């Protein structure tokens, strides 16, 4: 049967935030079967410098499970596979996610004691999924913000969050932020609207 | 706290008897539990010995070894935590062999020729492992052949054929091998070797 040097594939970049496990995928096709080693800065992993790492091997892929603790844990990692015929390496970048960019408020439609805030999702998730939205509102000329959190799926599927407990004939400012696993993102500018009588 | 959010490639490729992992990455707090389904059956099942589940903190992997055409198609990942539930569907695609390479040029010498080609437009979903070239003198019966690791063939998309006779017209054609098997043979390309002196 057909022998060949290992052929590797997997994503270019993998995103996470400090303290959060993520797996880097190294899929391998080789005959005869290959031995897979993971490297960073020339050393086999886990190493002294990169110690927050476990490897999960399966017949079709090796997974490097990395839990970054510091800035230095982000950067390039290498999967190398070796068999009788030769070797191949694939380089991955572990990227530090950002929090999301700001949602944009499109329109606010006030509905006695409530308001429907129509919004556009952040232009950038920061590399990991948006999990929730936070809305904050306050009557114009108050300092204290009221807030409510919304699941990101329900919110994004209609592009609306509904704000509640509003007083009639009152001008409010409302602003919106998106939360991903790393934390809360940039908060939108506040938009003003007035509730009905 | 939020209901689970799930991520992963929609389509996963393999051929009968070959294990592949379907990846379901999960973001949830509190931690979620992933369940897998195939044609309404909750896995693992005595009904499905060709399927193993490999869990890691950040992702569950369904290791499937298709034993028949009936094993391809949809698999569903679901995740549940205290807050809610999410599901993501995957398609396990049966890989094809590669489409045909295309021969662009042959640079002939006297007893050898360099054959330049474009790789198959479609790999069939699993990587190309090797190439097979075949060639035949215009008046002879046998197609001669040679195999090449795609690692070398793929560097320039050039392979060298050898054992040719001078001042002789040949056809050459090429096919690519992947894990599923040997793909479509290219259209033949005509060339003539240089004369002696």
CATH number of the domain that residue A156 is part of: 2.60.40.10
Residue B121 and residue B77 in one domain: no
* DSSP collapsed to 3 states, chain A: CCCEEEEEECCCEEEECCCCCEEEEEEEEEECCCEEEEEECCEECCCCCCCCEEEEEECCEEEEEECCCCHHHCEEEEEEEECCCCEEEEEEEEEECCCCCCCEEEEEEEECCEEEEEEECCCCCCCCCEEEEEEEEEEECECCCEEEEEEHHHHHHHCEEEEECCCCCCEEEEEEEEEECCCECCCCCCEEEECCC
Residues of B in contact with A22 (CB under 8 A): 58
CB contact under 8 A, A21 and B63: no
Please tell me which residue of chain A has the smallest CA distance to B24: A23
DSSP character at residue B40: T
Distance CA A13, CA A187 (A): 27
Enclosing domain of residue B15: 1-95
Same domain, B35 and B125: no
Residue A152 phi/psi, 5-degree rounding, is -75, -35
- CB contact (8 A) between residue A65 and residue B58: yes
Strand order in the sheet with A87-96: A13-16, A87-96, A75-82, A35-40, A43-44
Same domain, A41 and A103: no
Of the candidates A5, A21, A152, the beta carbon closest to that of B58 is on A21
Of B21, B27, B129, the CB nearest to A29: B129
Q: Domains in chain A: how many in total?
A: 2
**In a shared domain, residues B60 and B109:** no
> What is the number of other CB atoms lying within 10 angstroms of the CB of residue B67?
12
Determine the distance from the C-alpha atom of residue B113 to the mean position of all C-alpha atoms in its chain, rounded to a whole number.
28
The backbone torsions φ and ψ at residue B153, rounded to the nearest 5 degrees and listed phi first, read -60, -35
Residues of B in contact with A128 (CB under 8 A): 27
* Same-domain pairing of B101 and B197: yes
Same domain? B75 vs B11: yes
Residue with tokens 């062999």: B97
- Report the alpha-carbon distance of residue B131 to residue B113 in Å, rounded: 16
- Does residue B100 sit in the same domain as residue B193? yes
The experimental method is X-ray
Residues 6+ apart with CB under 8 A from A158: none
**CA–CA distances in Å: residue A145 to residues A103, A109, A142:** 18, 19, 8
> Do B124 and B84 sit in the same domain of this protein?
no
Residue A133 near residue A103 (C-beta atoms within 8 A): yes
The experimental resolution of this structure, in angstroms, equals 1.8
Per the CB < 8 A criterion, the answer to whether A82 and A35 are in contact is yes
Residues A86 and A148 in one domain: no
Question: Quick one: B134 and B120 in the same domain?
Answer: yes
CB A125 within 8 A of CB A131: no
Last residue of a domain, one of B31, B60, B95: B95
Chain A residues lying within 8 Å of B30, measured CB to CB: none
Quick one: B6 exposed, middle or buried, by C-beta within 10 A (0-12, 13-18, 19+)? buried
Which of A82, A97, A112 represents a domain boundary (last residue)? A97
Domain boundary among A97, A127, A160: A97
Q: Are A98 and A106 in contact (CB under 8 A)?
A: no
Tokens of B147: 């195999």
């Amino acid at each position: 049967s057909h022998m060949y040097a290992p052929k590797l594939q997997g994503p270019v970049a993998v995103y996470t935030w400090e303290g959060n496990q993520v797996n880097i995928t190294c899929e391998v096709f080789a005959y005869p079967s290959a031995t897979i080693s993971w490297f960073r800065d020339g050393q086999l992993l886990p190493s002294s410098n990169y110690s927050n790492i476990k490897i999960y091997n399966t017949p079709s892929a090796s997974y490097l499970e990395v839990t970054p603790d510091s800035e230095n844990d982000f950067g390039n990692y290498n999967c190398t596979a070796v068999n009788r015929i030769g070797q191949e390496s694939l380089e991955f970048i572990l990227v530090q996610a950002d929090t999301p960019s700001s949602p944009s408020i499109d329109q606010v439609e006030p509905y006695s004691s409530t308001a429907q805030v129509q919004f556009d999702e952040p232009e950038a998730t920061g590399g990991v999924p948006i999990l929730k939205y936070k809305a904050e509102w306050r009557a114009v000329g108050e300092e204290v913000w009221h807030s409510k959190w919304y699941d990101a799926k329900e919110a994004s599927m209609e592009g609306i969050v509904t704000i509640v407990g509003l007083k009639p004939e009152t001008t409010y400012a409302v602003r919106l932020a998106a939360l991903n696993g790393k934390g809360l993102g940039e908060i939108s500018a506040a938009s003003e609207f007035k509730t009905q009588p």
